[PDB]
mmCIF file of all heavy atoms in Angstrom:
data_model
loop_
_atom_site.group_PDB
_atom_site.id
_atom_site.type_symbol
_atom_site.label_atom_id
_atom_site.label_comp_id
_atom_site.label_asym_id
_atom_site.label_seq_id
_atom_site.Cartn_x
_atom_site.Cartn_y
_atom_site.Cartn_z
ATOM 1 N N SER A 1 0.841 -1.183 0.007
ATOM 2 C CA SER A 1 -0.001 0.006 -0.010
ATOM 3 C C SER A 1 0.884 1.237 -0.020
ATOM 4 O O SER A 1 0.665 2.157 -0.780
ATOM 5 C CB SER A 1 -0.934 0.012 1.199
ATOM 6 O OG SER A 1 -2.044 -0.833 1.010
ATOM 7 N N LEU A 2 1.855 1.301 0.886
ATOM 8 C CA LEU A 2 2.767 2.424 0.994
ATOM 9 C C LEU A 2 3.473 2.655 -0.320
ATOM 10 O O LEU A 2 3.519 3.764 -0.828
ATOM 11 C CB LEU A 2 3.792 2.194 2.098
ATOM 12 C CG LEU A 2 3.297 2.456 3.517
ATOM 13 C CD1 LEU A 2 3.455 1.248 4.405
ATOM 14 C CD2 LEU A 2 3.982 3.656 4.125
ATOM 15 N N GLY A 3 3.995 1.594 -0.916
ATOM 16 C CA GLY A 3 4.674 1.724 -2.197
ATOM 17 C C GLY A 3 3.835 2.442 -3.220
ATOM 18 O O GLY A 3 4.311 3.256 -4.009
ATOM 19 N N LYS A 4 2.523 2.154 -3.195
ATOM 20 C CA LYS A 4 1.577 2.772 -4.115
ATOM 21 C C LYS A 4 1.291 4.236 -3.711
ATOM 22 O O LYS A 4 1.554 5.140 -4.489
ATOM 23 C CB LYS A 4 0.269 1.979 -4.115
ATOM 24 C CG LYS A 4 -0.847 2.615 -4.955
ATOM 25 C CD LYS A 4 -2.236 2.200 -4.468
ATOM 26 C CE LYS A 4 -3.305 2.755 -5.351
ATOM 27 N NZ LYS A 4 -3.713 4.128 -4.942
ATOM 28 N N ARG A 5 0.781 4.449 -2.510
ATOM 29 C CA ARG A 5 0.466 5.751 -2.015
ATOM 30 C C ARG A 5 1.735 6.629 -1.969
ATOM 31 O O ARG A 5 1.677 7.854 -2.194
ATOM 32 C CB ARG A 5 -0.181 5.722 -0.647
ATOM 33 C CG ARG A 5 0.649 5.071 0.420
ATOM 34 C CD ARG A 5 0.322 5.616 1.805
ATOM 35 N NE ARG A 5 0.322 7.093 1.838
ATOM 36 C CZ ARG A 5 1.407 7.841 1.765
ATOM 37 N NH1 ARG A 5 2.625 7.273 1.677
ATOM 38 N NH2 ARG A 5 1.314 9.151 1.786
ATOM 39 N N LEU A 6 2.850 5.977 -1.648
ATOM 40 C CA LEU A 6 4.120 6.724 -1.565
ATOM 41 C C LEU A 6 4.467 7.246 -2.926
ATOM 42 O O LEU A 6 5.095 8.295 -3.050
ATOM 43 C CB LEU A 6 5.233 5.798 -1.035
ATOM 44 C CG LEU A 6 6.577 6.464 -0.786
ATOM 45 C CD1 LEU A 6 7.289 6.752 -2.104
ATOM 46 C CD2 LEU A 6 6.373 7.765 0.001
ATOM 47 N N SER A 7 4.106 6.479 -3.981
ATOM 48 C CA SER A 7 4.374 6.898 -5.348
ATOM 49 C C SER A 7 3.650 8.179 -5.674
ATOM 50 O O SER A 7 4.190 9.028 -6.379
ATOM 51 C CB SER A 7 3.924 5.784 -6.323
ATOM 52 O OG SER A 7 4.857 5.663 -7.384
ATOM 53 N N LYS A 8 2.461 8.344 -5.172
ATOM 54 C CA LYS A 8 1.660 9.530 -5.356
ATOM 55 C C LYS A 8 2.400 10.774 -4.916
ATOM 56 O O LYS A 8 2.537 11.740 -5.644
ATOM 57 C CB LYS A 8 0.312 9.419 -4.648
ATOM 58 C CG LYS A 8 -0.466 8.131 -4.943
ATOM 59 C CD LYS A 8 -1.753 8.424 -5.684
ATOM 60 C CE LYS A 8 -2.031 7.378 -6.761
ATOM 61 N NZ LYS A 8 -1.770 7.905 -8.119
ATOM 62 N N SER A 9 2.908 10.689 -3.662
ATOM 63 C CA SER A 9 3.693 11.788 -3.118
ATOM 64 C C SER A 9 4.920 12.049 -3.982
ATOM 65 O O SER A 9 5.327 13.239 -4.151
ATOM 66 C CB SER A 9 4.090 11.517 -1.680
ATOM 67 O OG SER A 9 3.160 10.643 -1.053
ATOM 68 N N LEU A 10 5.504 10.998 -4.479
ATOM 69 C CA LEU A 10 6.680 11.100 -5.308
ATOM 70 C C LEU A 10 6.365 11.818 -6.601
ATOM 71 O O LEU A 10 6.993 12.790 -6.986
ATOM 72 C CB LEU A 10 7.245 9.690 -5.624
ATOM 73 C CG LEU A 10 7.952 9.518 -6.948
ATOM 74 C CD1 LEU A 10 9.010 10.570 -7.173
ATOM 75 C CD2 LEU A 10 8.540 8.119 -7.075
ATOM 76 N N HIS A 11 5.314 11.337 -7.266
ATOM 77 C CA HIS A 11 4.857 11.935 -8.549
ATOM 78 C C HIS A 11 4.666 13.442 -8.369
ATOM 79 O O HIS A 11 4.832 14.187 -9.317
ATOM 80 C CB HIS A 11 3.563 11.248 -8.992
ATOM 81 C CG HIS A 11 3.365 11.293 -10.495
ATOM 82 N ND1 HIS A 11 2.427 10.501 -11.149
ATOM 83 C CD2 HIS A 11 3.999 11.990 -11.472
ATOM 84 C CE1 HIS A 11 2.510 10.737 -12.418
ATOM 85 N NE2 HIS A 11 3.449 11.637 -12.675
ATOM 86 N N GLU A 12 4.261 13.852 -7.169
ATOM 87 C CA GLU A 12 4.070 15.258 -6.897
ATOM 88 C C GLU A 12 5.379 16.005 -6.828
ATOM 89 O O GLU A 12 5.438 17.187 -7.173
ATOM 90 C CB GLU A 12 3.289 15.437 -5.553
ATOM 91 C CG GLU A 12 1.817 15.822 -5.739
ATOM 92 C CD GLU A 12 0.873 14.788 -5.175
ATOM 93 O OE1 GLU A 12 0.682 13.744 -5.824
ATOM 94 O OE2 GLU A 12 0.335 15.018 -4.085
ATOM 95 N N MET A 13 6.417 15.323 -6.382
ATOM 96 C CA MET A 13 7.750 15.889 -6.328
ATOM 97 C C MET A 13 8.190 16.467 -7.649
ATOM 98 O O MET A 13 8.626 17.591 -7.761
ATOM 99 C CB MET A 13 8.758 14.895 -5.837
ATOM 100 C CG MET A 13 9.815 15.466 -4.907
ATOM 101 S SD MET A 13 9.534 15.091 -3.163
ATOM 102 C CE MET A 13 9.747 13.344 -3.134
ATOM 103 N N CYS A 14 8.086 15.632 -8.715
ATOM 104 C CA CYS A 14 8.470 16.032 -10.047
ATOM 105 C C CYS A 14 7.315 16.713 -10.764
ATOM 106 O O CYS A 14 7.528 17.487 -11.701
ATOM 107 C CB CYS A 14 8.904 14.783 -10.823
ATOM 108 S SG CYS A 14 10.582 14.938 -11.541
ATOM 109 N N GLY A 15 6.092 16.469 -10.337
ATOM 110 C CA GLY A 15 4.928 17.074 -10.957
ATOM 111 C C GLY A 15 4.608 18.457 -10.447
ATOM 112 O O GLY A 15 3.524 18.970 -10.656
ATOM 113 N N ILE A 16 5.596 19.074 -9.741
ATOM 114 C CA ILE A 16 5.413 20.399 -9.211
ATOM 115 C C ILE A 16 6.664 20.872 -8.493
ATOM 116 O O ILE A 16 7.265 20.123 -7.723
ATOM 117 C CB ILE A 16 4.198 20.486 -8.271
ATOM 118 C CG1 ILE A 16 3.496 21.849 -8.404
ATOM 119 C CG2 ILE A 16 4.585 20.232 -6.805
ATOM 120 C CD1 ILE A 16 1.986 21.747 -8.271
ATOM 121 N N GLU A 17 7.061 22.121 -8.722
ATOM 122 C CA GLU A 17 8.221 22.669 -8.073
ATOM 123 C C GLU A 17 9.485 21.881 -8.438
ATOM 124 O O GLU A 17 9.374 20.828 -9.051
ATOM 125 C CB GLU A 17 8.041 22.694 -6.569
ATOM 126 C CG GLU A 17 8.143 24.120 -5.978
ATOM 127 C CD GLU A 17 8.781 24.119 -4.588
ATOM 128 O OE1 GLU A 17 8.681 23.054 -3.873
ATOM 129 O OE2 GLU A 17 9.306 25.118 -4.177
ATOM 130 N N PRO A 18 10.656 22.342 -8.057
ATOM 131 C CA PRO A 18 11.944 21.677 -8.357
ATOM 132 C C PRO A 18 11.896 20.202 -7.948
ATOM 133 O O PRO A 18 11.166 19.777 -7.072
ATOM 134 C CB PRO A 18 12.948 22.419 -7.487
ATOM 135 C CG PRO A 18 12.371 23.805 -7.352
ATOM 136 C CD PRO A 18 10.886 23.622 -7.313
ATOM 137 N N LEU A 19 12.725 19.407 -8.633
ATOM 138 C CA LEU A 19 12.817 17.966 -8.337
ATOM 139 C C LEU A 19 14.157 17.600 -7.745
ATOM 140 O O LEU A 19 15.174 18.194 -8.078
ATOM 141 C CB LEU A 19 12.551 17.175 -9.645
ATOM 142 C CG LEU A 19 13.127 17.809 -10.924
ATOM 143 C CD1 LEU A 19 13.625 16.765 -11.882
ATOM 144 C CD2 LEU A 19 12.025 18.656 -11.578
ATOM 145 N N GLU A 20 14.164 16.613 -6.865
ATOM 146 C CA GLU A 20 15.353 16.177 -6.221
ATOM 147 C C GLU A 20 15.773 14.768 -6.701
ATOM 148 O O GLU A 20 15.007 13.820 -6.554
ATOM 149 C CB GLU A 20 15.204 16.179 -4.680
ATOM 150 C CG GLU A 20 14.547 17.425 -4.141
ATOM 151 C CD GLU A 20 15.554 18.418 -3.597
ATOM 152 O OE1 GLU A 20 16.449 18.000 -2.842
ATOM 153 O OE2 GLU A 20 15.442 19.609 -3.947
ATOM 154 N N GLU A 21 16.967 14.666 -7.254
ATOM 155 C CA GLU A 21 17.481 13.412 -7.766
ATOM 156 C C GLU A 21 17.789 12.437 -6.625
ATOM 157 O O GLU A 21 17.545 11.245 -6.725
ATOM 158 C CB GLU A 21 18.741 13.624 -8.621
ATOM 159 C CG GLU A 21 19.412 12.351 -9.062
ATOM 160 C CD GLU A 21 20.565 12.634 -10.033
ATOM 161 O OE1 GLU A 21 21.532 13.285 -9.603
ATOM 162 O OE2 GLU A 21 20.477 12.188 -11.180
ATOM 163 N N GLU A 22 18.338 12.979 -5.515
ATOM 164 C CA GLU A 22 18.700 12.154 -4.374
ATOM 165 C C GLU A 22 17.438 11.499 -3.814
ATOM 166 O O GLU A 22 17.369 10.257 -3.666
ATOM 167 C CB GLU A 22 19.349 13.008 -3.308
ATOM 168 C CG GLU A 22 20.837 13.187 -3.483
ATOM 169 C CD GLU A 22 21.195 14.448 -4.267
ATOM 170 O OE1 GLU A 22 20.340 14.889 -5.050
ATOM 171 O OE2 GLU A 22 22.303 14.960 -4.089
ATOM 172 N N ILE A 23 16.424 12.295 -3.505
ATOM 173 C CA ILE A 23 15.167 11.773 -2.972
ATOM 174 C C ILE A 23 14.520 10.848 -3.976
ATOM 175 O O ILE A 23 14.050 9.762 -3.615
ATOM 176 C CB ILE A 23 14.212 12.927 -2.627
ATOM 177 C CG1 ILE A 23 14.699 13.663 -1.363
ATOM 178 C CG2 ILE A 23 12.787 12.390 -2.379
ATOM 179 C CD1 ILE A 23 15.781 14.665 -1.663
ATOM 180 N N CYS A 24 14.492 11.267 -5.219
ATOM 181 C CA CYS A 24 13.904 10.425 -6.289
ATOM 182 C C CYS A 24 14.661 9.096 -6.432
ATOM 183 O O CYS A 24 14.085 8.079 -6.830
ATOM 184 C CB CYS A 24 13.908 11.165 -7.627
ATOM 185 S SG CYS A 24 12.689 12.499 -7.739
ATOM 186 N N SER A 25 15.931 9.124 -6.039
ATOM 187 C CA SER A 25 16.763 7.913 -6.115
ATOM 188 C C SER A 25 16.489 7.005 -4.904
ATOM 189 O O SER A 25 16.195 5.813 -5.090
ATOM 190 C CB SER A 25 18.246 8.294 -6.161
ATOM 191 O OG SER A 25 18.743 8.557 -4.867
ATOM 192 N N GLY A 26 16.570 7.565 -3.731
ATOM 193 C CA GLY A 26 16.311 6.801 -2.522
ATOM 194 C C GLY A 26 14.927 6.201 -2.504
ATOM 195 O O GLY A 26 14.751 5.050 -2.106
ATOM 196 N N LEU A 27 13.942 6.966 -2.962
ATOM 197 C CA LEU A 27 12.547 6.495 -2.992
ATOM 198 C C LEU A 27 12.442 5.287 -3.922
ATOM 199 O O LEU A 27 11.774 4.294 -3.588
ATOM 200 C CB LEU A 27 11.635 7.620 -3.493
ATOM 201 C CG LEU A 27 10.926 8.370 -2.365
ATOM 202 C CD1 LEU A 27 11.917 9.024 -1.424
ATOM 203 C CD2 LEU A 27 9.983 9.419 -2.968
ATOM 204 N N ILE A 28 13.059 5.366 -5.098
ATOM 205 C CA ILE A 28 13.053 4.300 -6.045
ATOM 206 C C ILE A 28 13.786 3.047 -5.484
ATOM 207 O O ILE A 28 13.379 1.923 -5.742
ATOM 208 C CB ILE A 28 13.687 4.725 -7.410
ATOM 209 C CG1 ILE A 28 12.553 4.996 -8.422
ATOM 210 C CG2 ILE A 28 14.687 3.727 -7.901
ATOM 211 C CD1 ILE A 28 13.106 5.419 -9.792
ATOM 212 N N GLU A 29 14.840 3.318 -4.737
ATOM 213 C CA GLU A 29 15.609 2.214 -4.160
ATOM 214 C C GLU A 29 14.853 1.583 -3.020
ATOM 215 O O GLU A 29 14.766 0.328 -2.946
ATOM 216 C CB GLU A 29 16.957 2.757 -3.693
ATOM 217 C CG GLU A 29 18.122 2.493 -4.662
ATOM 218 C CD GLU A 29 18.962 1.298 -4.217
ATOM 219 O OE1 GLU A 29 18.389 0.191 -4.150
ATOM 220 O OE2 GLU A 29 20.179 1.475 -4.050
ATOM 221 N N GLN A 30 14.324 2.421 -2.109
ATOM 222 C CA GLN A 30 13.600 1.905 -0.947
ATOM 223 C C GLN A 30 12.387 1.085 -1.413
ATOM 224 O O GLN A 30 12.068 0.035 -0.812
ATOM 225 C CB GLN A 30 13.092 3.083 -0.122
ATOM 226 C CG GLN A 30 14.230 3.837 0.609
ATOM 227 C CD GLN A 30 14.827 3.061 1.751
ATOM 228 O OE1 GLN A 30 14.533 1.846 1.918
ATOM 229 N NE2 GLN A 30 15.679 3.691 2.542
ATOM 230 N N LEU A 31 11.730 1.530 -2.474
ATOM 231 C CA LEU A 31 10.595 0.823 -3.018
ATOM 232 C C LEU A 31 11.025 -0.518 -3.647
ATOM 233 O O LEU A 31 10.344 -1.536 -3.488
ATOM 234 C CB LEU A 31 9.863 1.664 -4.040
ATOM 235 C CG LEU A 31 8.641 2.427 -3.531
ATOM 236 C CD1 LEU A 31 8.916 3.909 -3.378
ATOM 237 C CD2 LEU A 31 7.422 2.204 -4.469
ATOM 238 N N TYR A 32 12.137 -0.496 -4.359
ATOM 239 C CA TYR A 32 12.656 -1.658 -4.991
ATOM 240 C C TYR A 32 13.053 -2.731 -3.975
ATOM 241 O O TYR A 32 13.132 -3.938 -4.275
ATOM 242 C CB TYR A 32 13.868 -1.314 -5.874
ATOM 243 C CG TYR A 32 14.420 -2.497 -6.654
ATOM 244 C CD1 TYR A 32 13.676 -3.152 -7.597
ATOM 245 C CD2 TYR A 32 15.711 -2.962 -6.406
ATOM 246 C CE1 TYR A 32 14.159 -4.222 -8.292
ATOM 247 C CE2 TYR A 32 16.212 -4.036 -7.108
ATOM 248 C CZ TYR A 32 15.471 -4.651 -8.049
ATOM 249 O OH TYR A 32 15.977 -5.757 -8.751
ATOM 250 N N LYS A 33 13.296 -2.302 -2.730
ATOM 251 C CA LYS A 33 13.679 -3.206 -1.679
ATOM 252 C C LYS A 33 12.426 -3.877 -1.117
ATOM 253 O O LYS A 33 12.475 -5.065 -0.711
ATOM 254 C CB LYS A 33 14.384 -2.444 -0.567
ATOM 255 C CG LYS A 33 15.883 -2.249 -0.797
ATOM 256 C CD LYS A 33 16.588 -1.697 0.423
ATOM 257 C CE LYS A 33 17.619 -0.654 0.034
ATOM 258 N NZ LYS A 33 18.381 -0.204 1.229
ATOM 259 N N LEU A 34 11.308 -3.148 -1.143
ATOM 260 C CA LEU A 34 10.037 -3.715 -0.656
ATOM 261 C C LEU A 34 9.396 -4.544 -1.734
ATOM 262 O O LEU A 34 8.701 -5.517 -1.468
ATOM 263 C CB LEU A 34 9.113 -2.583 -0.191
ATOM 264 C CG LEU A 34 7.943 -2.994 0.695
ATOM 265 C CD1 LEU A 34 6.978 -3.857 -0.093
ATOM 266 C CD2 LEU A 34 8.434 -3.778 1.922
ATOM 267 N N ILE A 35 9.601 -4.104 -2.974
ATOM 268 C CA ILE A 35 9.025 -4.804 -4.138
ATOM 269 C C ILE A 35 9.679 -6.201 -4.310
ATOM 270 O O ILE A 35 9.062 -7.145 -4.775
ATOM 271 C CB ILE A 35 9.133 -3.976 -5.417
ATOM 272 C CG1 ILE A 35 8.030 -4.378 -6.425
ATOM 273 C CG2 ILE A 35 10.519 -4.164 -6.054
ATOM 274 C CD1 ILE A 35 7.830 -3.369 -7.529
ATOM 275 N N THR A 36 10.932 -6.271 -3.957
ATOM 276 C CA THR A 36 11.713 -7.536 -4.040
ATOM 277 C C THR A 36 11.328 -8.458 -2.912
ATOM 278 O O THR A 36 11.224 -9.679 -3.095
ATOM 279 C CB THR A 36 13.211 -7.238 -4.060
ATOM 280 O OG1 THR A 36 13.536 -6.241 -3.095
ATOM 281 C CG2 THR A 36 13.729 -6.753 -5.387
ATOM 282 N N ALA A 37 11.160 -7.909 -1.728
ATOM 283 C CA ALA A 37 10.808 -8.671 -0.565
ATOM 284 C C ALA A 37 9.371 -9.201 -0.639
ATOM 285 O O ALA A 37 9.108 -10.405 -0.498
ATOM 286 C CB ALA A 37 11.001 -7.896 0.715
ATOM 287 N N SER A 38 8.444 -8.272 -0.918
ATOM 288 C CA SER A 38 7.022 -8.623 -1.027
ATOM 289 C C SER A 38 6.818 -9.672 -2.111
ATOM 290 O O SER A 38 6.025 -10.611 -1.919
ATOM 291 C CB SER A 38 6.178 -7.357 -1.326
ATOM 292 O OG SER A 38 5.753 -6.760 -0.157
ATOM 293 N N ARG A 39 7.538 -9.530 -3.211
ATOM 294 C CA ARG A 39 7.422 -10.476 -4.322
ATOM 295 C C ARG A 39 7.795 -11.906 -3.881
ATOM 296 O O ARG A 39 7.181 -12.871 -4.276
ATOM 297 C CB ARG A 39 8.306 -10.028 -5.493
ATOM 298 C CG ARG A 39 8.124 -10.855 -6.724
ATOM 299 C CD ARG A 39 9.297 -10.667 -7.729
ATOM 300 N NE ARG A 39 8.880 -10.992 -9.083
ATOM 301 C CZ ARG A 39 8.735 -12.262 -9.519
ATOM 302 N NH1 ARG A 39 8.907 -13.287 -8.721
ATOM 303 N NH2 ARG A 39 8.379 -12.468 -10.772
ATOM 304 N N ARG A 40 8.837 -11.987 -3.060
ATOM 305 C CA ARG A 40 9.288 -13.259 -2.519
ATOM 306 C C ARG A 40 8.239 -13.913 -1.661
ATOM 307 O O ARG A 40 8.188 -15.138 -1.540
ATOM 308 C CB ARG A 40 10.596 -13.083 -1.720
ATOM 309 C CG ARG A 40 11.822 -12.915 -2.584
ATOM 310 C CD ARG A 40 12.701 -14.184 -2.563
ATOM 311 N NE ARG A 40 13.336 -14.382 -1.283
ATOM 312 C CZ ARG A 40 13.915 -15.522 -0.904
ATOM 313 N NH1 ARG A 40 13.901 -16.577 -1.719
ATOM 314 N NH2 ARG A 40 14.515 -15.639 0.272
ATOM 315 N N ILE A 41 7.362 -13.089 -1.081
ATOM 316 C CA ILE A 41 6.298 -13.595 -0.211
ATOM 317 C C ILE A 41 5.189 -14.229 -1.048
ATOM 318 O O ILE A 41 4.738 -15.325 -0.754
ATOM 319 C CB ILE A 41 5.665 -12.496 0.667
ATOM 320 C CG1 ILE A 41 6.768 -11.479 1.103
ATOM 321 C CG2 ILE A 41 5.009 -13.109 1.875
ATOM 322 C CD1 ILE A 41 7.977 -12.102 1.710
ATOM 323 N N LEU A 42 4.772 -13.528 -2.109
ATOM 324 C CA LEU A 42 3.739 -14.009 -2.983
ATOM 325 C C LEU A 42 4.126 -15.359 -3.574
ATOM 326 O O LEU A 42 3.300 -16.296 -3.667
ATOM 327 C CB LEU A 42 3.456 -13.014 -4.095
ATOM 328 C CG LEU A 42 2.130 -12.271 -3.989
ATOM 329 C CD1 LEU A 42 2.392 -10.779 -3.659
ATOM 330 C CD2 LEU A 42 1.312 -12.406 -5.258
ATOM 331 N N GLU A 43 5.373 -15.504 -4.020
ATOM 332 C CA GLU A 43 5.850 -16.741 -4.580
ATOM 333 C C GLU A 43 6.006 -17.824 -3.548
ATOM 334 O O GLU A 43 5.885 -18.986 -3.811
ATOM 335 C CB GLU A 43 7.208 -16.520 -5.273
ATOM 336 C CG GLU A 43 7.211 -15.344 -6.259
ATOM 337 C CD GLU A 43 6.408 -15.692 -7.515
ATOM 338 O OE1 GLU A 43 5.225 -16.066 -7.379
ATOM 339 O OE2 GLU A 43 6.960 -15.533 -8.625
ATOM 340 N N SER A 44 6.276 -17.412 -2.281
ATOM 341 C CA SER A 44 6.449 -18.353 -1.177
ATOM 342 C C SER A 44 5.192 -19.224 -1.032
ATOM 343 O O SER A 44 5.292 -20.403 -0.711
ATOM 344 C CB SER A 44 6.735 -17.602 0.116
ATOM 345 O OG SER A 44 7.605 -18.321 0.957
ATOM 346 N N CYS A 45 4.037 -18.606 -1.250
ATOM 347 C CA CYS A 45 2.769 -19.336 -1.140
ATOM 348 C C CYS A 45 2.437 -20.071 -2.459
ATOM 349 O O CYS A 45 1.626 -20.986 -2.456
ATOM 350 C CB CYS A 45 1.627 -18.368 -0.801
ATOM 351 S SG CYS A 45 0.791 -18.739 0.782
ATOM 352 N N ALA A 46 3.098 -19.672 -3.544
ATOM 353 C CA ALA A 46 2.873 -20.292 -4.830
ATOM 354 C C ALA A 46 1.474 -19.979 -5.355
ATOM 355 O O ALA A 46 0.747 -19.155 -4.784
ATOM 356 C CB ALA A 46 3.091 -21.798 -4.745
#
């Protein structure tokens, strides 16, 4: 859920006012860490 809703806040970062590469990078990385873990869970159940 956070990955999704968190994306909204992110989209706002670039969709208005100056954009930050660092934040845009960490956010993408932090999400990729949850997307990789969560994915392992779905497959765990098969």
Side-chain angles (χ1 to χ4, degrees):
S1 280
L2 280 124
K4 175 206 184 272
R5 61 152 309 288
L6 186 285
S7 218
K8 308 245 141 255
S9 332
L10 149 52
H11 209 165
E12 254 118 283
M13 215 102 67
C14 236
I16 215 145
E17 239 214 335
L19 34 145
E20 314 262 313
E21 174 174 63
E22 276 93 333
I23 289 80
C24 285
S25 82
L27 262 59
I28 255 181
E29 261 260 58
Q30 292 287 10
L31 261 107
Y32 183 63
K33 276 189 221 185
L34 197 293
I35 206 164
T36 41
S38 269
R39 188 197 202 286
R40 281 255 289 165
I41 325 310
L42 252 111
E43 308 289 55
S44 215
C45 240

